[PDB]
């Protein structure tokens, strides 16, 4: 897990995200879809988007960006005491959404990318370290739930 100091770094970084949650969410999803087009195919309601201009222009995508990062933020604010919030997330994504576990890695790397893009010079080594640990914890606990269910079997 993370030390108290690391969680503080994580939640201080998350304040940057909360100043524009939609925009961070949009750019994270865009980064995921364009870097990993397979991921787009799992979203029936974004499959129609062919170009990054169309993605950028989609108001529904931004809105969904809010849904996604709200969910993540509430989990991060638990500082690892997240079983109630994380387990249903895991289960929904393994069963209903059919999301391969590796897609969590992809979005983790996208979050780091987008934080640097939007906050150049203001997302230091310490802060990236901490956020990376939190996203690892996140993936690791989701993976445990996936394993229960036999992944995408
Ligand atoms: C989930 N988007």
UniProtKB/Swiss-Prot annotation:
O2 binds at residue 64. Its EC number is 1.7.-.-, 1.11.1.-. It catalyses: Fe(III)-heme b-[protein] + nitric oxide + H2O = Fe(II)-heme b-[protein] + nitrite + 2 H(+); H2O2 + AH2 = A + 2 H2O. The modification Phosphoserine is found at residue 3. The keyword Signal does not apply. Nitrite binds at residue 64. InterPro entries: Globin, Globin-like_sf, Myoglobin. Keywords: Cytoplasm, Heme, Iron, Metal-binding, Muscle protein, Oxidoreductase, Oxygen transport, Phosphoprotein, Transport. Pfam families: Globin. Residues 1-147 form the Globin domain. Disulfide bonds: none annotated. GO terms for cellular component: sarcoplasm. Heme b binds at residue 93. One of its GO terms (molecular function) is oxygen carrier activity. It is found in: Cytoplasm, Sarcoplasm. One of its GO terms (biological process) is oxygen transport. Monomeric heme protein which primary function is to store oxygen and facilitate its diffusion within muscle tissues. Reversibly binds oxygen through a pentacoordinated heme iron and enables its timely and efficient release as needed during periods of heightened demand. Depending on the oxidative conditions of tissues and cells, and in addition to its ability to bind oxygen, it also has a nitrite reductase activity whereby it regulates the production of bioactive nitric oxide. PANTHER family: MYOGLOBIN (PTHR47132:SF1). Monomeric. Belongs to the globin family. This is Myoglobin. It comes from Equus caballus (Horse).
